[PDB]
Design a binder for this molecule. Sequence first.
Ligand SMILES: CC(C)CCC[C@@H](C)[C@H]1CC[C@H]2[C@@H]3CC=C4C[C@@H](O)CC[C@]4(C)[C@H]3CC[C@]12C
Ligand SMILES: CC(C)CCC[C@@H](C)[C@H]1CC[C@H]2[C@@H]3CC=C4C[C@@H](O)CC[C@]4(C)[C@H]3CC[C@]12C
Ligand SMILES: CCCCCCCC/C=C\CCCCCCCC(=O)OC[C@H](O)CO
Ligand SMILES: CCCCCCCC/C=C\CCCCCCCC(=O)OC[C@H](O)CO
Ligand SMILES: CCCCCCCC/C=C\CCCCCCCC(=O)OC[C@H](O)CO
Ligand SMILES: CC(C)(C)NC[C@H](O)COc1nsnc1N1CCOCC1
Length: 439
Amino acid sequence: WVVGMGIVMSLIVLAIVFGNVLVITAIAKFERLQTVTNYFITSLACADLVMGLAVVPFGAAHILMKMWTFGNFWCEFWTSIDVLCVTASIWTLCVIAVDRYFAITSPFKYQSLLTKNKARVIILMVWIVSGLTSFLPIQMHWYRATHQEAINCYAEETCCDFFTNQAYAIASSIVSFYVPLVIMVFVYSRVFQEAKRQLNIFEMLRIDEGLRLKIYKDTEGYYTIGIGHLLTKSPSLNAAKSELDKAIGRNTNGVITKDEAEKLFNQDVDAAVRGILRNAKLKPVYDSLDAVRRAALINMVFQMGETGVAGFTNSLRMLQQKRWDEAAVNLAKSRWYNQTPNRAKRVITTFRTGTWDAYKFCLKEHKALKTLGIIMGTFTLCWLPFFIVNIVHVIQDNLIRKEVYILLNWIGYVNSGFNPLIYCRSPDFRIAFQELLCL
Ligand SMILES: CC(C)CCC[C@@H](C)[C@H]1CC[C@H]2[C@@H]3CC=C4C[C@@H](O)CC[C@]4(C)[C@H]3CC[C@]12C
Ligand SMILES: CC(C)CCC[C@@H](C)[C@H]1CC[C@H]2[C@@H]3CC=C4C[C@@H](O)CC[C@]4(C)[C@H]3CC[C@]12C
Ligand SMILES: CCCCCCCC/C=C\CCCCCCCC(=O)OC[C@H](O)CO
Ligand SMILES: CCCCCCCC/C=C\CCCCCCCC(=O)OC[C@H](O)CO
Ligand SMILES: CCCCCCCC/C=C\CCCCCCCC(=O)OC[C@H](O)CO
Ligand SMILES: CC(C)(C)NC[C@H](O)COc1nsnc1N1CCOCC1
């Protein structure tokens, strides 16, 4: 039996060290991943690396041997490092949540207001302050209990059970875990709401239209470039390049920058807007719609044209009469829904609710925010039961057992190995991992 669990704990130790070193190396090697967000992720990965190298191995030894053979010095230093890493992780995540809040509320959406040199200082202080609040109360004996069972364990070298006084157990839990948790959960819930609120048609079209810097053929087969900007309907490749050289004003050779792609995207959206106001059929429909449904109407005009969207005589009728559910059924009863289902479904669903439920976490930066949300969420689900049980044991010290306390602590220790697997979501990290593993 002892072996069966010893192997499991060894696979945990290895998974944490392997995965976190891989995360740290990728952010330190590849310039594309050297962003302010990934600096905090590095801080988070190092906390988990110290957890897998200096905390879990000695924790596993303490359980299987049922005693502490590392002396009274390492017992306290080990406990301090354990408390440090958890504190450093939750505060780093809180800082990430705050960083992402100020990034999305500003016009430089998804870009951190903090510079790289300032971000390193934040991290440094998050480890210095967490260093003092974790080590000092343990090294200066402010944590120690005064009852007999506890004093026997402190004197005995072979005992390393973490007995604490009621004051420390509450004060440390609130300052080290609950305060940054509540703020993180409150501040990052707003981040998901700002993402769902501030996204307009410039992101809506960018998502379902895509972006390519080179000349490609659309679903219909015509030469297109950028964010669905149709160059020509002619089957000639040089005709497409000729219309591309005309539109931009230089010899592009069928290749453009992201700037030029956005400049054309602004012109196409404005031309769609103007075209709706021009067309007598689309003109009253656009006025009767709210800011979100207007974007859904411009989306259709961007894809089919003003003349094509004017064909929906029954759909346009009911969109002005506030009959969303019926108008959405008629949009499904058209060749547009049959041709491009995934896109039409999202546009129809936008007319349905009048919200952005269909475009949730579809944009690249939104998936990046969702990933960060999973990192925070997993940390909460893995550590909250331990801390809840920690405060419950202070109130009534005869409700939770020792085995239950240690088990929930290990659900928290196994959380150190989850992050690298969760980073696979990000396309930048996948490429980076399989490059370091030489695959
Ligand atoms: C020694 C044990 C107990 C814990 C101490 C680990 C400390 C020194 C580690 C953990 C995480 C670390 C930081 C993680 C990320 C960055 C950003 C990087 O671009 C420069 C260094 C910097 C700022 C690190 C400095 C050192 C750091 C604070
Ligand atoms: C007792 C043991 C666990 C303590 C050892 C802590 C180790 C893991 C710490 C100490 C100093 C650290 C490094 C300090 C500086 C950097 C540069 C940064 O660009 C990436 C993180 C990185 C590479 C850190 C990785 C982790 C590191 C090597
Ligand atoms: C995938 C699950 C496998 C089961 C778990 C066993 C993991 C192996 C254990 C420890 C390795 C620790 C060392 C970290 C890995 C180094 C590889 C790395 O990141 O590459 C370096 C890069 O090539 C430099 O340029
Ligand atoms: C214990 C003594 C330490 C006292 C110091 C802690 C005080 C902060 C407290 C709560 C807010 C938590 C978030 C704080 C981190 C801010 C993150 C950041 O810098 O925010 C990015 C923003 O863009 C910048 O303008
Ligand atoms: C029941 C509702 C849950 C209430 C939960 C109470 C948590 C209090 C949080 C912060 C106050 C301390 C200030 C920390 C520094 C500012 C952080 C910030 O930028 O937050 C913006 C805010 O999230 C945009 O609504
Ligand atoms: C109990 C033992 C062996 C130290 N494991 C420790 C935890 O995994 C890490 O605990 C903490 N991280 S930040 N704050 C804490 N605590 C939680 C327990 O009460 C004192 C302070």
